[PDB]
Structures are given as structure tokens and as C-alpha cells.
């Protein structure tokens, strides 16, 4: 069933995008959703997403533009220790130039640059470039 | 194709689609305030009835249930307009 | 049917199960439905029902066997005849 | 697509936005108090009162009209059943089953449908007794099962 | 005179006095009477807008407010009248907890129900402001910058009475709770 609700949502992304499709919604919506999309805004990966508040669990509506080739995520959330963090980003992103692995630390959702930046590790959601 | 304004979705199209597919679930569905002809009391029938739905005075029968709306019996009429 | 209400009077009224006491509540009047089943037999059957008649009582033959009855009235057990005192919300009594 | 089923459905209530009550409605939450009440008292299930209420009578949902669910007004006031009104309508069913199954023991139909509904009670079961609605220790018995109802 | 009717802890005189002494004038009044007996404020601020016709905002105990809805639209119509230039609307005083982290722990204290946290009370806040247009429902923008402006669809019965206030409402959350929104008037179902 529903089990993981980006999983869910990012196929749905991704799997528009493809088809050029201008933008699109996603059926459960959620908090982790929001959060991990409002990083994909600041890097240009997707344009501005419009809320709906369905009584219940919640929509959204993607406004899209060209520039996201995929986004994915990694089903579980393994614990990412800055040590690996390179060896994940060497294997799951095409260049060390761009490509962003969304992961949720202490400090909040954020890409791995901010992590970085930080200093701080945590858990893996996904990746778009 | 290509360009659905789908969070401004012009009011035919959604009534084309399944309750819950809709942009907000919103039921189809209504009550009605039936008169019938012997008494001027007015019940607060729902449209999709379940049960047979009996005069508050007493010996009329206002609604036969099927599968989706009520059988209205005969002669009795309704208003939707509300909310 | 006969489940559904009898339920209903087990849990909420009051009776009386069997014989001698329903046969009591029929002597002192206190008794307005007395539900034989089939299997009480034939003797027993036509003396409740007569000894009812004469009182001015609903009688009725479930269609049962002592014991659809028992299981009927939530007990859990052989119950040949019973008598309805009162009820509670149900309207087993017509 | 349902629990024991191959029929992957859906046909399910919808509510509105709104929740705050339609204004028809005169009652308030003290008169539908005063009337779920009655009805249960008359010997109804939580189902089908809500139901009573809303064709005939009014509430659209009696939770939005009072404060809490029709359940919680039964219980609060003790006219709630002994057991949950959603777990014997499976009960009642499967001593329907096990009735003819006595009476003809060739219905292989009958010998799911019997094994389903077992199962359908387990399960519901065994959370009712880790929301503690039943005590940790009451159990089926086809033998028991009759009398329950 | 005053004080009788907004007690809490709070008096700072000002318009506190002022607007309950209007209340207390609305007493003085055939039928619009004994209703208002039972009732009560708590406190009462003036804020102004972007326009710059500031409206006054009234807050409400809580329990108070479902009778505050009966008598509101008869209400603020005469005290509006009165207390002249201003927009006048009514909110229930909610508490608003905090939320217990394992910093701010769990030493004891009861629960804090979903009523008391935050975004139902800001929420319930919608509810208050525009009584008599009642929402049918939100959507919520996400500029590209991050900010982030909600949008919330009201019906049309009494849109008359709202529709002239509108960037008072605007203007209100902003100074309650935060948050910047725009009233949408639209289709029906
Ligand atoms: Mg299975």
C-alpha cells in the first residue's frame, strides 16, 4: 500500500517530466513532501508549488519548467555519517558539478551541500540533479 | 496536454469526475425540504435515503429507496438550494 | 423474525424461563407473551396453551427445538417454554 | 483492493470543506443527544442511527453537530453494547454460515466463507485487545460463538 | 462604565473602556439585551492597515464566542456605527501551548490537546475573522523565494457585509499570528 509517500510523490515528478508535462499534482501530500520540494525550488529543479488543503491528508500542484531530468529516492533511509557522504554522492549523482541529494539531519531538510556546511550527518530521502 | 490549469479547473469538468478524484473531495449529494400534498409540514429528506423516510404527521409514505436517489412518492416536491 | 426482538427483551425487560414459575406468571396474570417451542410435548403444549387462552395471553410456537430458544435468549442452554413479563424497547409484544 | 477479495473497488462517503453545521438544522447538539439516545434505547447500532438521522431527520453528521462521535455518546452514558457492534454483524454472520454448514456438508463455498469470516473476526479481534475494548482473554468458540449473539 | 464587562487581568483602560462602555450602551436597547448580559470580553487592540483605516479587533473567553456568532452581525453593525472610521471583529482568546520537546520536556504536564496546539488555533483564528462569509477552502502558495501566502476561498452568503473589509483580515493575522493572505470569491458546486 502506501508505504512511502515520496516515493509515491517523485515517480509521479519525475514520471511527469518526462513527458514534458507543464505541472502536476501529487494525491497525498504530506509535510516531508513540502519540505523536501521547497529545497528543489531554491536550485531551479522545479518552479513555484501551489498547496491544496483538502480537509483530509492534502494536494499539491507542481508548477514544473524543463530542468529536472530525475528525481528519486532511496527507500530506506539509510544513516548517512559525512564520512560516506562522498560515497554516496560519488554513486548517485552523474558529476561531482551538480546533483543534489535531498537528507533530513538535526538541522532541519536540506541538500548535502548544506549539510556540509554545517557539519552535521543524518538520513538519506532522495536526489535530484 | 501539456498545460491543465488543474488548480483553476473550469466547473463542468469537475462534475465529470468521481467524487473523490476531484481537486477537493466534495460529495454528490443533497438534502431536500419536501412538502407533499396532505400535510403542509415540510422533512429534511437526504436525496440518497437508505430508509423510508415517513411523514411527521403520519400516515404518507414520502420516499421509496433504490440503489442511488430516493423514489419520491407520486406527488411531493423538493429544494435543493442551501449552503 | 424472533431472534432479533428476543434478544432485545433478554438484555432490557424481564421473564421468566421454563415452566412453573411461567406457569406462576400466568396464574398471577403478570404474563402477556408465553413462547413455547416445538418439543415441548404435545400435553404440555395444549395445558400452556389452554391454561393461557383462559387468561388472555399471546402464545407462540417458535419455530424452534427446546433449544433454538436457548440460544435465542442469550442463555446458554435448554429452555422448552418462557413467559414475557415486560419488555424493553422492543416491541415483541403487538 | 479489499482485504479478501480479488475486487480492488472504491465506493466510499465524501464530506465537504465545510464542516460547521447547514443552518436548516434546528435541534442542536442537546435535541440530537436527546434523540440518538432514543433510538438506542429502542436498540440500534451506532451505524444505524447515524443513519435514522440523516435521511429522515437532519444530521448531515452528528460529530460536527455535537461535539464528539455518536459511540461516545452511547458509552459515556452506558447504552453502548457489550462488544463492538462492527465485530458480531461477523460474529452473527459466521454462526449463520456454521448453521447451514451443519446442515449441508458439501457447501465447499460455505468452507471459505466460513475460514474468510473466522478470520475477519481474529483479526479484529486481536487490535480490540490492544485498544482494550475486550478483556485480554475472550476468545472465538464456535460452541460459545451462538449464544453471543 | 468600563471595567465590568473585559475581565481577565488585563485593564489598561484605553479603548478597553471606550469600546466596553459602547457594549454597555448597546444595552440600552430593546432586544439587544439580557443576551449580552451573559457575555463578556477579555481584551481589545487597535491595529491599522496597509490602506490606513486601522480596525479594531475584539478577542472573546472561548466558551463566549458560539453566543458572540449569534449576536455578532447585529452587533458590530451598531457598534461600528458608533465608534466610527473602523472595521470592528470578533476573536476567541486562545492559549496556544507549546510544543514539548525532549528539551522542554515531559516532568508532567497534561497532555495538550490538538484545540490548544498551534496550527488549529491559527486556524480556528480563519474561523473568527470572517463569521459571516465561512471558508470553503484554502490553497496555500510557495513563492520562489520561500514565503509562503495562503489564499482562502470564502462562500458568498454575506460577502456583502466581508467583501468591503477584506485587507482588514489581511491586515489582522499579520499582526496575530504572521502570516500574509488574499480572499478569493468564487464558483460554486
Ligand atoms: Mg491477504
Redesign the interface.
Given at each position: 500500500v502506501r508505504m512511502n509517500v515520496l516515493a509515491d510523490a517523485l515517480k509521479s515528478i519525475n514520471n511527469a517530466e518526462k513527458r514534458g508535462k507543464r505541472q502536476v499534482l501529487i494525491r497525498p501530500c504530506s509535510k516531508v513532501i513540502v519540505r523536501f520540494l521547497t529545497v528543489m525550488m531554491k536550485h531551479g529543479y522545479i518552479g513555484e508549488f501551489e498547496i491544496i488543503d483538502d480537509h483530509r491528508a492534502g494536494k499539491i500542484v507542481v508548477n514544473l519548467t524543463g530542468r529536472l531530468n530525475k528525481c528519486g529516492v532511496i527507500s530506506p533511509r539509510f544513516d548517512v555519517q559525512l564520512k560516506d557522504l562522498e560515497k554516496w554522492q560519488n554513486n548517485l549523482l552523474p558529476s561531482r558539478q551538480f546533483g543534489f541529494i535531498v537528507l533530513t539531519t538535526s538541522a532541519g531538510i536540506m541538500d548535502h551541500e548544506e549539510a556540509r556546511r554545517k557539519h552535521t550527518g543524518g538520513k538519506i530521502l532522495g536526489f535530484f540533479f | 496536454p501539456?498545460?491543465?490549469?488543474?488548480?483553476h479547473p473550469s466547473?463542468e469538468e469537475?462534475k465529470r469526475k468521481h467524487?473523490?478524484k476531484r481537486?477537493?473531495?466534495?460529495?454528490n449529494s443533497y438534502?431536500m425540504?419536501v412538502k407533499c400534498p396532505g400535510c403542509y409540514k415540510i422533512?429534511?429528506?437526504?436525496s440518497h435515503?437508505?430508509?423510508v423516510?415517513?411523514c411527521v404527521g403520519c400516515s404518507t409514505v414520502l420516499?421509496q429507496?433504490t440503489g442511488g436517489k430516493?423514489r419520491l412518492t407520486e406527488g411531493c416536491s423538493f429544494r435543493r438550494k442551501?449552503? | 423474525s424472533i431472534n432479533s426482538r428476543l434478544q432485545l427483551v433478554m438484555k432490557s425487560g424481564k421473564y421468566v424461563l421454563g415452566y412453573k414459575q411461567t406457569l406462576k406468571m400466568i396464574r398471577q396474570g403478570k404474563a402477556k407473551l408465553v413462547i413455547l417451542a416445538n418439543n415441548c410435548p404435545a400435553l404440555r403444549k395444549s395445558e400452556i396453551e389452554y391454561y393461557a387462552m383462559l387468561a388472555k395471553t399471546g402464545v407462540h410456537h417458535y419455530s424452534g427445538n427446546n433449544i433454538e430458544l436457548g440460544t435465542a435468549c442469550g442463555k446458554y442452554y435448554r429452555v422448552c417454554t418462557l413467559a414475557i413479563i415486560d419488555p424493553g424497547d422492543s416491541d415483541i409484544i403487538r | 483492493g479489499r482485504m479478501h477479495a480479488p475486487g480492488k473497488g472504491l465506493s466510499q462517503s465524501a464530506l465537504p470543506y465545510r464542516r460547521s453545521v447547514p443552518t436548516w438544522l434546528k435541534l442542536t447538539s442537546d435535541d440530537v443527544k436527546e434523540q440518538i439516545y432514543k433510538l438506542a434505547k429502542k436498540g440500534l447500532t451506532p451505524s444505524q442511527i447515524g443513519v435514522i438521522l440523516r435521511d429522515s431527520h437532519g444530521v448531515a453528521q452528528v460529530r460536527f453537530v455535537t461535539g464528539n462521535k455518536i459511540l461516545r455518546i452511547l458509552k459515556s452514558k452506558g447504552l453502548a453494547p457489550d462488544l463492538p457492534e462492527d465485530l458480531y454483524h461477523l460474529i452473527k454472520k459466521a454462526v449463520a454460515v456454521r448453521k447451514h454448514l451443519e446442515r449441508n456438508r458439501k457447501d465447499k463455498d460455505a468452507k471459505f466463507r466460513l475460514i474468510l469470516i473466522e478470520s475477519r473476526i481474529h483479526r479484529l479481534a486481536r487490535y480490540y485487545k490492544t485498544k482494550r475494548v475486550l478483556p485480554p482473554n475472550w476468545k472465538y468458540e464456535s460452541s460459545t460463538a451462538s449464544a453471543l449473539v | 462604565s468600563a471595567k465590568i464587562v473585559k475581565p481577565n487581568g488585563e485593564k489598561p483602560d484605553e479603548f478597553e473602556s471606550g469600546i466596553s462602555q459602547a457594549l454597555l450602551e448597546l444595552e440600552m436597547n430593546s432586544d439587544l439585551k439580557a443576551q449580552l448580559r451573559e457575555l463578556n470580553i477579555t481584551a481589545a487592540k487597535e491595529i491599522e492597515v496597509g490602506g490606513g483605516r486601522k480596525a479594531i479587533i475584539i478577542f472573546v473567553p472561548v466558551p463566549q464566542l458560539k453566543s458572540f456568532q449569534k449576536i455578532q452581525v447585529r452587533l458590530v453593525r451598531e457598534l461600528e456605527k458608533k465608534f466610527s472610521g473602523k472595521h470592528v471583529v470578533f476573536i476567541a482568546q486562545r492559549r496556544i501551548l507549546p510544543k514539548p520537546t525532549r528539551k522542554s520536556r515531559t516532568k508532567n504536564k497534561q497532555k495538550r490537546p490538538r484545540s490548544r496546539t498551534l496550527t488549529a488555533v491559527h486556524d480556528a483564528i480563519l474561523e473568527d475573522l470572517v463569521f459571516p462569509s465561512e471558508i470553503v477552502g484554502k490553497r496555500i502558495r510557495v513563492k520562489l523565494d520561500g514565503s509562503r501566502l495562503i489564499k482562502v476561498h470564502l462562500d458568498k452568503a454575506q460577502q456583502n457585509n466581508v467583501e468591503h473589509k477584506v485587507e482588514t483580515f489581511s491586515g489582522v493575522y499579520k499582526k496575530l499570528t504572521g502570516k500574509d493572505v488574499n480572499f478569493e470569491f468564487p464558483e460554486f458546486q
Open positions: - | 501539456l498545460a491543465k490549469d488543474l488548480l466547473p469537475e467524487k473523490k481537486l477537493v473531495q466534495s460529495p438534502f425540504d422533512t429534511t429528506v437526504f435515503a437508505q430508509t423516510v415517513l420516499c429507496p430516493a442551501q449552503h | - | - | -
